[PDB]
Amino acid sequence: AKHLKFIARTVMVQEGNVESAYRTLNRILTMDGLIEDIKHRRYYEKPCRRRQRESYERCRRIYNMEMARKINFLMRKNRADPWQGC
Amino acid sequence: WLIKEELEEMLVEKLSDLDYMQFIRLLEKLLTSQCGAAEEEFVQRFRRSVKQLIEPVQYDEQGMAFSKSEGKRKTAKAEAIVYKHGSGRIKVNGIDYQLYFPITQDREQLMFPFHFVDRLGKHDVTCTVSGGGRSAQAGAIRLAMAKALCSFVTEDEVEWMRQAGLLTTDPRVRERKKPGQEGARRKFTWKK
Numbered sequence A: 001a002k003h004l005k006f007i008a009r010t011v012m013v014q015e016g017n018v019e020s021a022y023r024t025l026n027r028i029l030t031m032d033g034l035i036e037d038i039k040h041r042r043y044y045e046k047p048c049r050r051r052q053r054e055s056y057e058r059c060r061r062i063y064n065m066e067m068a069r070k071i072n073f074l075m076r077k078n079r080a081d082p083w084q085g086c
Numbered sequence B: 001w002l003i004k005e006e007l008e009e010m011l012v013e014k015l016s017d018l019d020y021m022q023f024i025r026l027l028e029k030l031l032t033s034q035c036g037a038a039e040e041e042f043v044q045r046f047r048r049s050v051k052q053l054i055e056p057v058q059y060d061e062q063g064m065a066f067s068k069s070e071g072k073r074k075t076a077k078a079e080a081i082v083y084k085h086g087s088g089r090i091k092v093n094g095i096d097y098q099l100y101f102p103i104t105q106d107r108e109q110l111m112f113p114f115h116f117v118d119r120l121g122k123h124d125v126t127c128t129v130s131g132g133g134r135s136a137q138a139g140a141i142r143l144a145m146a147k148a149l150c151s152f153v154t155e156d157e158v159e160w161m162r163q164a165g166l167l168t169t170d171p172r173v174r175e176r177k178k179p180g181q182e183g184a185r186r187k188f189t190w191k192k
Helices: A018-032 A034-041 A047-078 B004-011 B017-032 B037-046 B104-116 B134-150 B155-164
Strands: B065-073 B076-083 B090-092 B125-130
Touching (some): A018 A034, B004 B017, B065 B134, B076 B134, B104 B134, B104 B155, B125 B134
Antiparallel strands (some): B076 B125
16 A cells, blocks of 8 residues: 555566466465465464464475475486396 | 296296286397397297188189189178179079169179279179078178179289278177067166
C-alpha cells in the first residue's frame, strides 16, 4: 500500500511470450513460498496443526535430502557389471 | 540357443531360469567377442540348428499341359485342374461358373487368384467341389485354383500369391457347441 507499485513481483515479458513470463513469475512466487503461503492462509491453520505440519515437512526434507545424497553417491555404481559371469 | 531343458540334460543338473539366462548372456558375449575356431568349436556345442511345393505339370491325352491341385475350406473340398492355355473358361462340377455361383461374391473369389497374377482369360479350369455351402465351396475352389496355377506362374509370382494369402488353407472351422451353454461361446442368460 505505502510502497511503490510495479516493482514487487513484477516480471517483464520477452518478445511477447506471456506464457514464459507467467511461468517465470510462478517460479518466483513458488520459490519465495508465496503460493504455499496463500494456499495455507485461505483457512486458519490452528497453531498445533501448523506445528505438526512444520515438523512433518522438516522430517520429510531431512529424509529426502539424505536419500538424494545416497542416490547421488551410489549413482556411479550403475556401471556395467565388470565381472560378468564370475 | 539350446533351451534350459537341453542345458539341464547336458549338465545332469537342475538349473533355474535366471541361471540359464546368465549362461546365455555369457555365451552371447563370447560369440560377440570375435570368437575364433578355438572358441567356436566350444560354442557350437550349445547351438541348435533350426516356399510353396509346386505341383508337377501333367499332360492330357491331347498333349495339352495342365496342373492338378486340391483345397479345402470349412467342409468343402475342391479338386481343380488348370490348363496351361485357355480362354478363361471355368467349369465347376460340369457347370459354367457364372451358373454354379450366381453370387457376385463367389465369382469374385474365383476371380481373385487369376486377377492377382494378371492371367485373366489365359487359363481354362475344371473344378469339382463337394461339401459345404456356396461360400465354402468358392473359397475351396479359389485355394485349389491358386495352387494349380502356381505350377504355371513364376516363383516370384508364387511367393507374391503366398504373401497375399492365396495359398494358405483357412483353418477357421465351426467351433463345437459346449454343454451347458447356448453355443460355442454364447452362454446361457445369467440369472443373478
